[PDB]
Amino acid sequence: YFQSMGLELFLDLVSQPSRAVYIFAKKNGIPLELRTVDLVKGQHKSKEFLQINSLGKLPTLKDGDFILTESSAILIYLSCKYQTPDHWYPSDLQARARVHEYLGWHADCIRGTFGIPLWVQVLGPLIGVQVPKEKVERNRTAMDQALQWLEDKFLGDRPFLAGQQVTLADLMALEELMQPVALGYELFEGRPRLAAWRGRVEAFLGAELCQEAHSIILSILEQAAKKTLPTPSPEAYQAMLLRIARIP
Amino acid sequence: GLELFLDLVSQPSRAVYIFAKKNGIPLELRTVDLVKGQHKSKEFLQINSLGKLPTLKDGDFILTESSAILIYLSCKYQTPDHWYPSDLQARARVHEYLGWHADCIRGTFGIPLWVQVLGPLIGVQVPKEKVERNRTAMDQALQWLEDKFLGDRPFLAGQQVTLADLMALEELMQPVALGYELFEGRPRLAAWRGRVEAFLGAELCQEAHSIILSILEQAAKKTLPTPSPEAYQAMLLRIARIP
DSSP states (O other): OOOOSSOEEEEOTTSHHHHHHHHHHHHTTOOOEEEEOOTTTTGGGSHHHHHHOTTOOSOEEEETTEEEEOHHHHHHHHHHHTTOOGGGSOSSHHHHHHHHHHHHHHHHHTTTTTTHHHIIIIIHHHTTOOOOHHHHHHHHHHHHHHHHHIIIIIITTSSBTTBSSOOHHHHHHHHHHHHHHHTTOOTTTTOHHHHHHHHHHHHHHOHHHHHHHHHHHHHHHHHHHTTOSOOOOHHHHHHHHHHHHTOO | OEEEEEOTTSHHHHHHHHHHHHTTOOEEEEEOOTTTTGGGSHHHHTTOTTOOSOEEEETTEEEEOHHHHHHHHHHHTTOOGGGSOOSHHHHHHHHHHHHHHHHHTTTTTTHHHIIIIIHHHTTOOOOHHHHHHHHHHHHHHHHHIIIIIITTSSBTTBSSOOHHHHHHHHHHHHHHTTTOOTTTTOHHHHHHHHHHHHHHOHHHHHHHHHHHHTHHHHHHTTOSOOOOHHHHHHHHHHHHTOO
């Protein structure tokens, strides 16, 4: 409800696109007031938050009167407004097209697929709901196919997903792949090219930045096990039920 | 010369087709028959390994994803600013819609074609429970489109037609073409469609929508091609991702 003097970012580091924007702002030293909005508790569906963003999704950027959603949109906005190093989002027509191509494919094949293990293992059981085994198997196969395409189409024999340098594409991809990794799905094993890529991206980001970005997600399974997670609000419950029923 | 590989039965294919035609961008149009499975053939997999439409080929440079294609074409051919405004916040609004679209529209609004035509074509019924869940999901997404994106503004991302309106319209056309009259009872959405279609022109709209608008009749009359085994495989995978 209350604001800081400038740029506010409403986020929860349990969320993949929140972590992507967090990392981008931190790495570029973009001065940003972090406002934590607790997803599990349901604070993104609170009256106060819906007043800011009627969609009630994270991350949300507030720049004065200007309120903006969608990590890709937020990332591009900040990169321009703050004139970040070119490699992140290259001016070059074709190099930029490669970043947009990845982002488009990501929205389709990664987003909404790689997050599912959190629902299976933590969030569903948290409200008494099990994800059927057949769906879990389907999701695992879907993840493996997507990693194969990630390796073959995008990475190739190149250092990063959209060319010779780290772009927004790499940031988005990593934070999504981190979700199953944090729950004990070791996605990089048996995938040497992908493993090398991760090492490359994380080396660039810095160990300390990666640590603080990934801290929450790396502890969530254990916190769920010790039953220290918040009880979802009725609004969060409703949204959770809908999300779970969207698992194919 | 540029080539566009496309099939007008497909929503993102139509969006790119419309943008190019409205802007007079000279493209070699190359029809790739999706139902037959030409997108999964060796010759096309040799061009786009992902075997997905639309695909744009610019000499050596091969590009997929309608959003990426649209942006690329807009900069390459320097189309009128309004399609993709250079203004920081106007542009962010376009990206914001496109991202939300990929999550809430793309993959949801196409489902009735699978229910009514494509599934039955290969002996697969979509369970009623999924059909009803999909209908509810469409209605919820339409509500966000009206309340959050349009509001009382003329278009989805501001005062003028942008890439956002093109993608939205072509996705919404899919259920419409299959008998879901979803602009009924939703004045803001109906007015928006009227605005977008008036800007594009009746002939371009007619040309873009002709194929999808005749697909139910083709299914009823049983004149649709038999899918290749590769198409069949992909169809089963797509049907199984309906929740």
